[PDB]
């Protein structure tokens, strides 16, 4: 067999995806939730389960207190991280972790102790022979198939942009806006209070998230859509709660993702995603802006709202000089793009040198990742 | 099933899963050859929980507490929890593993349990 | 009604009971044909839209 | 071993068969509604 397939694990704030190197799709996709029972057991002899990891916690929502180990792209709780990683390796994949290399992804700007802790955990506990850590929005270009473009990756944790020109990435033009999908979920919870529907518990935030994923879209023109919503009731939808109640979403459908383009709704003074992309363009040099305007790439699940590509194209066309043409490239499989390009990274023949060996970790501590990765 | 091939994700996962289930069935049948038992279907036969206890008795080399006698769901949960408690006492790290997961018959959890008992008793 | 017979009322109830069982049988076959047709139509539409 | 016990057994069997029949019928009806609910949007998207 000689060379063995190296598995890739994409960890984000929302979902964890995992799969082998050569596959076109991930093996397994599941939410990154850890659940614990709030009530006390009353019947003798069901069986003991201290914690619920993954889809089992999502099945028994109304009995647990759900918890997220990743906050804004930073691992807040580590024992939960061994819980999800053990459930990934030994349950979803059924593979021995000590006989494969592991590829992992992370945000561009983050504390270095995060990288050191993932390296130490992958080497000391799981006995992985080799590992690598990569930036997500770099892998989006591998998934796209071009070596020149700007990536805006918007996940559940962060929204970061990076430009790459002909394989050279400019580190001073990288911007990391902290707006993401969980803030939009909280804003949707706040604006559903206006109609009278109250959603409070952690088990009910998943219901709010599903409502967000199903009946939301980005308006092309915000004030005109406000006028249309105030005029008639054509743009109203009805959602079915798990217990049989029916709610009427109405106006709010295009008021949740509009906070992406105007962060003053959430109290933040930061610029929107389109102005962040434009500012990341203008932080680069003169000669490469023409190529970067023609290769804007969307990535991440948060950019799956309908009509977001047209809105971004219109806003950037308004900001940019009129003599150039702007095309937003939004593939229909952007949600797994961070995974897909990563798989391509594990199939190249020249990538076998870049792996962090076990001997290098043994002789240099966990700080070797600051020299070997990126 | 049209919904099975609807998405490229789970169809591929079950393509691996069927072969893994065949391999695990052959592996458990060899260790259950000595005792008068056979695993016709991996999901249906382990729902009772007695047969997994017999597997543990063959593999470990020491006797296990005898199962309780009953026909209801509580007895099956009791039998599964006995084997899970014995595995926990053997310092085999099992997480996200509950008796009701085995009794309900989740595919991934049963396969993970068999893979873990293969790896840790080898 | 002052004049009634227990046998006759029981007999009418048996009549209604067999009518219920038969009705539920046409209901079942009815709905099985319906679901098969809808599944096939959805599959064909999905293939051609893809 | 007589006809009356056979009558009682026959009507009891018929009754429980009928009950199982409406249970299966109503479950199938709700599944049918869901499938049609899904298919109609696909036709509109084709247009």
């Amino acid at each position: 067999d000689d060379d063995i397939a190296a598995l890739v694990v994409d960890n984000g704030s929302g979902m964890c995806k995992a799969g082998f190197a050569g596959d076109d799709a991930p093996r397994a996709v599941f939410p990154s939730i850890v659940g614990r029972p709030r009530h006390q057991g009353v019947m003798v002899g069901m069986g003991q389960k201290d914690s619920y990891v993954g889809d089992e916690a999502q099945s028994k929502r109304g009995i647990l207190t759900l918890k997220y180990p990743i906050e804004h792209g930073i691992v807040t709780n580590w024992d939960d991280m061994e819980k999800i990683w053990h459930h990934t390796f030994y349950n979803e994949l059924r593979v021995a972790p000590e006989e494969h290399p592991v590829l992992l992804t992370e945000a561009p700007l983050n504390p270095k102790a995060n990288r050191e802790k993932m390296t130490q955990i992958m080497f000391e506990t799981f006995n992985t022979p080799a590992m690598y850590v990569a930036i997500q929005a770099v892998l989006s270009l591998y998934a796209s198939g071009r070596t020149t473009g700007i990536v805006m990756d918007s996940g559940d944790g962060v929204t970061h942009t990076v430009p790459i020109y002909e394989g050279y990435a400019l580190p001073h033009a990288i911007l990391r806006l902290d707006l993401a999908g969980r803030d939009l979920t909280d804003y949707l919870m706040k604006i559903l209070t206006e109609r009278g529907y109250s959603f409070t518990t952690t088990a009910e935030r998943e219901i709010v998230r599903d409502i967000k994923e199903k009946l939301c879209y980005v308006a092309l023109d915000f004030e005109q859509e406000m006028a249309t919503a105030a005029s008639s009731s054509s743009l109203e939808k009805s959602y079915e709660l798990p217990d049989g109640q029916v709610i009427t979403i109405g106006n709010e459908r295009f008021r949740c993702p509009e906070a992406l383009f105007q962060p003053s709704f959430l109290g933040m003074e930061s610029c929107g995603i389109h102005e962040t992309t434009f500012n990341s363009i203008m932080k680069c040099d003169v000669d490469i802006r023409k190529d970067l305007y023609a290769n804007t790439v969307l990535s991440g699940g948060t950019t799956m709202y309908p009509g977001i590509a047209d809105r971004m194209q219109k806003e950037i066309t308004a900001l940019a000089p009129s003599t150039m043409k702007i095309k937003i490239i939004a593939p229909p499989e952007r949600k797994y793009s961070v995974w897909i390009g990563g798989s391509i990274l594990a199939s190249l023949s020249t990538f076998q040198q870049m792996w962090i060996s076990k001997q290098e970790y043994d002789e240099s501590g966990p700080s070797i990742v600051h020299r070997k990765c990126f | 099933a049209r919904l099975f091939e609807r998405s490229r994700i789970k169809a591929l996962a079950d393509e691996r899963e069927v072969v893994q289930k065949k391999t695990f069935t052959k592996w458990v049948n060899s260790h259950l050859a000595r005792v008068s038992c056979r695993i016709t279907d991996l999901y249906k036969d382990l729902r009772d929980g007695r047969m997994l206890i017999k597997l543990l008795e063959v593999l470990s080399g020491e006797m296990l507490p005898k199962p309780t006698k009953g026909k209801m769901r509580i007895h099956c949960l009791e039998n599964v929890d006995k084997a899970l408690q014995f595995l926990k006492e053997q310092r085999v790290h099992l997480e996200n593993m509950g008796s009701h997961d085995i009794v309900d018959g989740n595919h991934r959890l049963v396969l993970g349990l068999i893979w873990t008992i293969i790896l840790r008793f080898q | 009604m002052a004049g009634i017979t227990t046998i006759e009322a029981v007999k009418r109830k048996i009549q209604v009971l067999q009518q219920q069982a038969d009705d539920a049988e046409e209901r079942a076959e009815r709905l099985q044909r319906e679901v098969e047709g809808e599944r096939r139509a959805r599959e064909q539409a999905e293939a051609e839209v893809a | 071993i007589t006809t009356i016990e056979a009558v009682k057994r026959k009507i009891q069997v018929l009754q429980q068969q009928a009950d199982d029949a409406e249970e299966r019928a109503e479950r199938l009806q709700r599944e049918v509604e869901g499938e049609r609910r899904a298919r109609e949007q696909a036709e509109a998207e084709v247009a």
Partner: peptide, 22 residues
């Protein structure tokens, strides 16, 4: 499976019911 496909840009995991609005 990547090594067979020329373009992962034009790739489908599901119909996705895109472009439903208007």
């Amino acid at each position: 499976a990547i090594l067979d496909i020329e373009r992962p840009d034009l790739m489908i995991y599901e119909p996705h019911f895109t472009y439903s609005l208007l």
